[PDB]
Amino acid sequence: FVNQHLCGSHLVEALYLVCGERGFFXX
Amino acid sequence: GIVEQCCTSICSLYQLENYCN
Q1: Where would one find coiled-coil regions in this protein (chain A)?
Q2: Domain coordinates of chain A in residue numbers?
Q3: Which residue among A2, A25, A27 places its CB closest to the CB of B11?
């Protein structure tokens, strides 16, 4: 399903979803 | 970096998962 360019601030939306419970932001 | 990469190209799940904590 990772099928598209992620522009705007859609990269953090994608990371939020795919990284799930472990997260991604900061440390 | 990843912001530029994933806007100008289609990132894979591999590439995104490199940025998970």
Answers
A1: none
A2: 1-27
A3: A2
